[PDB]
Amino acid sequence: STGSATTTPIDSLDDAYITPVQIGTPAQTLNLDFDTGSSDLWVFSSETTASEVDGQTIYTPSKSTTAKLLSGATWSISYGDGSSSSGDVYTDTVSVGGLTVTGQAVESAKKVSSSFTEDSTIDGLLGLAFSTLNTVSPTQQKTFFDNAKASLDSPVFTADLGYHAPGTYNFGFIDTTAYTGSITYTAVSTKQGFWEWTSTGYAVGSGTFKSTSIDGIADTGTTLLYLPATVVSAYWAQVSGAKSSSSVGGYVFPCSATLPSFTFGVGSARIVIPGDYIDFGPISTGSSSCFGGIQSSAGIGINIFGDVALKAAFVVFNGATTPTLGFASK
């Protein structure tokens, strides 16, 4: 089997992407944030504290003929941005782009933090990291991908995120029309539960490539590219008027600037992030100061190849016995 679903930016900055997902019988369609940096599929629901729901579409398990409470199971998650959610657990039929999993754990939110309430466009998350990170207790549950895997034509999914435009998540096949050139594959460590890999270096604009190992994660659920302070300083030093602002919370630059590209290495291959992808717009409405899309990972504890990086590539998440990541230009 295979599945193919369009993913759409939630706003004009590509802060996140939402993908329609069918849950239950008859189908209830919710727009979920596919997150390769976590491993819980959780949704706003009929059980979510009413004051914490503001415009989201909710899952109502009592209206689904295929829903069943996983008795005694609970979940609780907190994300890198400090947001969180928690609740109880159902199993139900879940379909993404024509690919159906029966008995998928659907984590029903009883409580969500303010950032989720305030984002009317995201009805929940669909985690695509390794199932070892799943937060269900007492017995951890499998991700949608883990459950689908044995049914898939090939044990892969691909992320093809758009710059200010829709893109695609495919399951079970590689669309050879969706990228240019070849896909370069690189090793993955699952030791921390992430799609963790080692970039071979970077270049700033037309500069020479610096060969240096940068360990990080491929994370569709993070907006920006977070890299070591050395790398990030070298980038912004090439932008007139750029500086790190503690009051704003990162590097800022004059909105009139022309940003250099940023190249990262994947083995002997190279992915070029155009300068425009690094512009995240005014720091506040009407400001002539703009926020950078490449920021320091110092204090996160891990480097993160978030959407700024991933949307410059066609990315293969290979869930074979020995997992790997593939990157192609597009």
Swiss-Prot record:
Keywords: Aspartyl protease, Disulfide bond, Hydrolase, Protease, Signal, Zymogen. Disulfide bonds join 255-290. It is an enzyme of class 3 (hydrolase). Belongs to the peptidase A1 family. GO terms for molecular function: aspartic-type endopeptidase activity. The active site is at residues 35, 199. Residues 17-328 form the Peptidase A1 domain. This is Endothiapepsin. GO terms for biological process: proteolysis. It catalyses: Hydrolysis of proteins with specificity similar to that of pepsin A, prefers hydrophobic residues at P1 and P1', but does not cleave 14-Ala-|-Leu-15 in the B chain of insulin or Z-Glu-Tyr. Clots milk. Its EC number is 3.4.23.22.
